[PDB]
Short mmCIF file of all heavy atoms in Angstrom, two decimals:
data_model
loop_
_atom_site.label_atom_id
_atom_site.label_comp_id
_atom_site.label_asym_id
_atom_site.label_seq_id
_atom_site.Cartn_x
_atom_site.Cartn_y
_atom_site.Cartn_z
N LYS A 28 -50.08 244.77 -150.10
CA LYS A 28 -51.35 244.10 -150.37
C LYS A 28 -51.03 242.83 -151.26
O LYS A 28 -50.29 243.01 -152.23
CB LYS A 28 -52.36 244.98 -151.03
CG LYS A 28 -53.81 244.66 -150.66
CD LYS A 28 -54.65 245.95 -150.60
CE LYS A 28 -56.11 245.58 -150.19
NZ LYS A 28 -56.23 245.08 -148.80
N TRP A 29 -51.60 241.73 -150.88
CA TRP A 29 -51.38 240.46 -151.62
C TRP A 29 -52.60 239.99 -152.40
O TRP A 29 -53.72 239.89 -151.81
CB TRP A 29 -50.95 239.36 -150.63
CG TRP A 29 -50.73 238.01 -151.27
CD1 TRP A 29 -49.97 237.67 -152.31
CD2 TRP A 29 -51.37 236.78 -150.78
NE1 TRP A 29 -50.07 236.33 -152.55
CE2 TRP A 29 -50.97 235.74 -151.64
CE3 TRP A 29 -52.29 236.48 -149.75
CZ2 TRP A 29 -51.38 234.45 -151.54
CZ3 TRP A 29 -52.71 235.15 -149.60
CH2 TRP A 29 -52.21 234.16 -150.48
N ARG A 30 -52.46 239.77 -153.68
CA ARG A 30 -53.57 239.36 -154.56
C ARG A 30 -54.75 240.29 -154.57
O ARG A 30 -55.91 239.89 -154.75
CB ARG A 30 -54.04 237.92 -154.22
CG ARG A 30 -53.01 236.81 -154.51
CD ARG A 30 -53.68 235.45 -154.49
NE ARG A 30 -54.26 235.18 -153.13
CZ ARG A 30 -55.25 234.29 -152.89
NH1 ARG A 30 -55.77 233.59 -153.84
NH2 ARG A 30 -55.68 234.17 -151.62
N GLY A 31 -54.43 241.60 -154.41
CA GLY A 31 -55.43 242.65 -154.51
C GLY A 31 -56.34 242.86 -153.32
O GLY A 31 -57.02 243.90 -153.32
N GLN A 32 -56.32 241.99 -152.35
CA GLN A 32 -57.24 242.16 -151.18
C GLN A 32 -56.79 241.71 -149.79
O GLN A 32 -57.58 241.83 -148.83
CB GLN A 32 -58.63 241.52 -151.50
CG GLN A 32 -59.61 242.52 -152.08
CD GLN A 32 -60.90 241.88 -152.55
OE1 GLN A 32 -61.38 240.92 -151.94
NE2 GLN A 32 -61.46 242.41 -153.60
N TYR A 33 -55.52 241.23 -149.68
CA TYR A 33 -55.06 240.83 -148.36
C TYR A 33 -53.97 241.82 -147.86
O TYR A 33 -53.00 242.03 -148.55
CB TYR A 33 -54.59 239.38 -148.36
CG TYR A 33 -55.72 238.42 -148.63
CD1 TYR A 33 -56.29 238.35 -149.94
CD2 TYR A 33 -56.24 237.59 -147.65
CE1 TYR A 33 -57.33 237.46 -150.23
CE2 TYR A 33 -57.32 236.69 -147.92
CZ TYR A 33 -57.85 236.68 -149.19
OH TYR A 33 -58.92 235.83 -149.52
N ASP A 34 -54.18 242.40 -146.68
CA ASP A 34 -53.19 243.19 -145.99
C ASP A 34 -52.12 242.30 -145.41
O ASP A 34 -52.48 241.41 -144.61
CB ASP A 34 -53.82 244.07 -144.95
CG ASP A 34 -54.88 245.08 -145.53
OD1 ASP A 34 -54.60 245.61 -146.63
OD2 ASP A 34 -55.90 245.26 -144.88
N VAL A 35 -50.88 242.47 -145.77
CA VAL A 35 -49.82 241.59 -145.26
C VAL A 35 -48.65 242.41 -144.70
O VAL A 35 -48.42 243.56 -145.10
CB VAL A 35 -49.28 240.60 -146.39
CG1 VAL A 35 -50.40 239.70 -146.81
CG2 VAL A 35 -48.65 241.35 -147.57
N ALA A 36 -47.93 241.82 -143.74
CA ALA A 36 -46.65 242.28 -143.34
C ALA A 36 -45.61 241.38 -144.01
O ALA A 36 -45.84 240.15 -144.26
CB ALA A 36 -46.49 242.20 -141.80
N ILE A 37 -44.47 241.94 -144.43
CA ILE A 37 -43.42 241.24 -145.12
C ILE A 37 -42.20 241.12 -144.20
O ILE A 37 -41.66 242.13 -143.70
CB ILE A 37 -43.07 241.94 -146.49
CG1 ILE A 37 -44.34 242.03 -147.33
CG2 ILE A 37 -42.01 241.11 -147.22
CD1 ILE A 37 -44.24 243.05 -148.43
N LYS A 38 -41.80 239.87 -143.98
CA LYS A 38 -40.68 239.59 -143.08
C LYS A 38 -39.63 238.76 -143.79
O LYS A 38 -39.99 237.87 -144.57
CB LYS A 38 -41.17 238.87 -141.82
CG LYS A 38 -42.27 239.60 -141.07
CD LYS A 38 -43.00 238.64 -140.12
CE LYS A 38 -43.90 239.36 -139.12
NZ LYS A 38 -43.08 240.12 -138.09
N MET A 39 -38.35 239.08 -143.59
CA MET A 39 -37.33 238.31 -144.17
C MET A 39 -36.81 237.20 -143.21
O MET A 39 -36.91 237.33 -141.97
CB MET A 39 -36.18 239.19 -144.64
CG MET A 39 -36.66 240.12 -145.76
SD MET A 39 -35.52 241.49 -146.03
CE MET A 39 -35.63 242.35 -144.45
N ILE A 40 -36.32 236.12 -143.84
CA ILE A 40 -35.73 234.98 -143.18
C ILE A 40 -34.20 235.13 -143.23
O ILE A 40 -33.61 235.37 -144.25
CB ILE A 40 -36.16 233.64 -143.82
CG1 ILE A 40 -37.52 233.17 -143.24
CG2 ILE A 40 -35.15 232.50 -143.49
CD1 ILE A 40 -38.68 234.08 -143.61
N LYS A 41 -33.56 235.03 -141.99
CA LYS A 41 -32.13 235.00 -141.89
C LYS A 41 -31.51 233.97 -142.85
O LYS A 41 -31.85 232.78 -142.80
CB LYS A 41 -31.68 234.66 -140.49
CG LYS A 41 -31.47 235.88 -139.54
CD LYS A 41 -30.30 236.79 -139.98
CE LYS A 41 -28.97 236.22 -139.68
NZ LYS A 41 -28.51 236.55 -138.30
N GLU A 42 -30.56 234.44 -143.66
CA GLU A 42 -29.91 233.58 -144.61
C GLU A 42 -29.10 232.47 -143.97
O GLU A 42 -28.46 232.71 -142.90
CB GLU A 42 -29.07 234.34 -145.58
CG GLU A 42 -29.82 235.02 -146.67
CD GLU A 42 -29.02 235.74 -147.64
OE1 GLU A 42 -27.93 235.27 -148.07
OE2 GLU A 42 -29.48 236.85 -148.12
N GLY A 43 -29.05 231.29 -144.52
CA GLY A 43 -28.22 230.15 -144.09
C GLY A 43 -28.54 229.51 -142.82
O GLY A 43 -27.87 228.56 -142.42
N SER A 44 -29.55 230.00 -142.11
CA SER A 44 -29.94 229.49 -140.78
C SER A 44 -30.78 228.17 -140.91
O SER A 44 -30.93 227.47 -139.91
CB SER A 44 -30.68 230.52 -139.98
OG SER A 44 -31.77 231.05 -140.67
N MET A 45 -31.26 227.92 -142.08
CA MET A 45 -32.13 226.79 -142.40
C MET A 45 -31.88 226.33 -143.78
O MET A 45 -31.50 227.10 -144.64
CB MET A 45 -33.54 227.27 -142.29
CG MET A 45 -34.52 226.31 -141.66
SD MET A 45 -36.11 227.12 -141.35
CE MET A 45 -35.63 228.68 -140.70
N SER A 46 -32.05 224.95 -144.00
CA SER A 46 -31.98 224.48 -145.37
C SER A 46 -33.32 224.81 -146.03
O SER A 46 -34.37 224.92 -145.35
CB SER A 46 -31.70 223.01 -145.41
OG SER A 46 -32.80 222.22 -144.84
N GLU A 47 -33.31 224.93 -147.34
CA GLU A 47 -34.52 225.27 -148.16
C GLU A 47 -35.67 224.29 -147.97
O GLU A 47 -36.80 224.65 -147.79
CB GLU A 47 -34.13 225.38 -149.63
CG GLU A 47 -35.13 226.18 -150.46
CD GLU A 47 -34.70 226.30 -151.89
OE1 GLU A 47 -34.69 225.21 -152.59
OE2 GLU A 47 -34.41 227.40 -152.36
N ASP A 48 -35.38 222.99 -147.97
CA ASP A 48 -36.32 221.90 -147.77
C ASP A 48 -36.90 221.93 -146.40
O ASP A 48 -38.08 221.72 -146.18
CB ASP A 48 -35.66 220.55 -148.05
CG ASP A 48 -35.39 220.32 -149.49
OD1 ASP A 48 -35.82 221.14 -150.36
OD2 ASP A 48 -34.76 219.33 -149.85
N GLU A 49 -36.06 222.23 -145.40
CA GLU A 49 -36.39 222.30 -144.00
C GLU A 49 -37.33 223.51 -143.73
O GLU A 49 -38.22 223.43 -142.84
CB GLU A 49 -35.15 222.42 -143.14
CG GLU A 49 -35.21 221.79 -141.76
CD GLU A 49 -33.80 221.39 -141.24
OE1 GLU A 49 -32.82 221.63 -141.92
OE2 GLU A 49 -33.73 220.83 -140.10
N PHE A 50 -37.08 224.54 -144.51
CA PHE A 50 -37.92 225.71 -144.41
C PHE A 50 -39.32 225.54 -144.94
O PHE A 50 -40.33 225.98 -144.40
CB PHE A 50 -37.26 226.95 -145.11
CG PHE A 50 -38.12 228.16 -145.23
CD1 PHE A 50 -38.33 229.01 -144.19
CD2 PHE A 50 -38.81 228.38 -146.45
CE1 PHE A 50 -39.20 230.07 -144.25
CE2 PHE A 50 -39.64 229.47 -146.57
CZ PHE A 50 -39.83 230.31 -145.50
N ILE A 51 -39.42 224.86 -146.16
CA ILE A 51 -40.68 224.62 -146.79
C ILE A 51 -41.61 223.77 -145.97
O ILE A 51 -42.82 224.11 -145.82
CB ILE A 51 -40.48 224.10 -148.25
CG1 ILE A 51 -39.89 225.24 -149.10
CG2 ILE A 51 -41.77 223.62 -148.87
CD1 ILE A 51 -39.37 224.76 -150.48
N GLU A 52 -41.13 222.63 -145.46
CA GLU A 52 -41.92 221.81 -144.58
C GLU A 52 -42.50 222.48 -143.37
O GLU A 52 -43.65 222.33 -143.08
CB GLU A 52 -41.09 220.52 -144.16
CG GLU A 52 -39.76 220.82 -143.48
CD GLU A 52 -39.17 219.59 -142.83
OE1 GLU A 52 -39.71 219.18 -141.73
OE2 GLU A 52 -38.21 219.02 -143.30
N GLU A 53 -41.61 223.31 -142.75
CA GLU A 53 -42.07 224.10 -141.58
C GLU A 53 -43.15 225.12 -141.98
O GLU A 53 -44.07 225.41 -141.22
CB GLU A 53 -40.92 224.76 -140.88
CG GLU A 53 -40.27 223.89 -139.85
CD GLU A 53 -39.68 224.71 -138.68
OE1 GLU A 53 -40.41 225.41 -138.03
OE2 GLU A 53 -38.42 224.67 -138.54
N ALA A 54 -42.99 225.81 -143.15
CA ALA A 54 -43.94 226.72 -143.71
C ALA A 54 -45.27 226.04 -143.99
O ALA A 54 -46.35 226.60 -143.71
CB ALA A 54 -43.39 227.37 -144.98
N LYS A 55 -45.18 224.81 -144.47
CA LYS A 55 -46.41 224.00 -144.74
C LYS A 55 -47.17 223.66 -143.46
O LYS A 55 -48.40 223.77 -143.49
CB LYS A 55 -46.01 222.64 -145.40
CG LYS A 55 -45.65 222.82 -146.87
CD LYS A 55 -44.95 221.52 -147.38
CE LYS A 55 -44.80 221.55 -148.90
NZ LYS A 55 -46.04 221.26 -149.58
N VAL A 56 -46.47 223.30 -142.37
CA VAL A 56 -47.15 223.09 -141.09
C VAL A 56 -47.85 224.32 -140.59
O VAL A 56 -49.02 224.29 -140.16
CB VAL A 56 -46.10 222.61 -139.99
CG1 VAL A 56 -46.81 222.28 -138.71
CG2 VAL A 56 -45.36 221.39 -140.46
N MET A 57 -47.13 225.47 -140.71
CA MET A 57 -47.70 226.73 -140.21
C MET A 57 -48.89 227.22 -140.96
O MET A 57 -49.72 227.91 -140.35
CB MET A 57 -46.58 227.82 -140.26
CG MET A 57 -45.59 227.75 -139.13
SD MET A 57 -44.30 228.88 -139.42
CE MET A 57 -45.10 230.44 -139.15
N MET A 58 -48.97 226.98 -142.25
CA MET A 58 -50.07 227.38 -143.08
C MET A 58 -51.35 226.57 -142.83
O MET A 58 -52.45 227.02 -142.97
CB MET A 58 -49.70 227.35 -144.54
CG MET A 58 -49.17 228.70 -145.00
SD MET A 58 -48.57 228.62 -146.71
CE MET A 58 -46.94 227.99 -146.40
N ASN A 59 -51.18 225.27 -142.38
CA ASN A 59 -52.24 224.47 -142.01
C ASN A 59 -52.76 224.71 -140.61
O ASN A 59 -53.69 224.14 -140.12
CB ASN A 59 -51.83 222.98 -142.16
CG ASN A 59 -51.81 222.52 -143.58
OD1 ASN A 59 -52.70 222.79 -144.33
ND2 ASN A 59 -50.75 221.83 -143.94
N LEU A 60 -52.04 225.63 -139.87
CA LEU A 60 -52.50 226.07 -138.58
C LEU A 60 -53.47 227.24 -138.77
O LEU A 60 -53.00 228.43 -138.84
CB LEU A 60 -51.32 226.45 -137.65
CG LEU A 60 -50.30 225.34 -137.30
CD1 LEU A 60 -49.09 225.91 -136.56
CD2 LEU A 60 -50.92 224.18 -136.52
#
Side-chain angles (χ1 to χ4, degrees):
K28 212 149 183 65
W29 176 55
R30 293 192 299 159
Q32 267 172 36
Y33 298 69
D34 298 321
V35 298
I37 305 161
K38 304 161 167 292
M39 296 164 297
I40 276 67
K41 269 296 284 276
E42 281 184 40
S44 55
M45 219 170 315
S46 67
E47 201 180 64
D48 290 352
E49 214 154 359
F50 169 80
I51 290 168
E52 53 166 289
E53 274 210 62
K55 285 166 171 285
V56 183
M57 280 173 71
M58 268 174 276
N59 286 315
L60 300 170

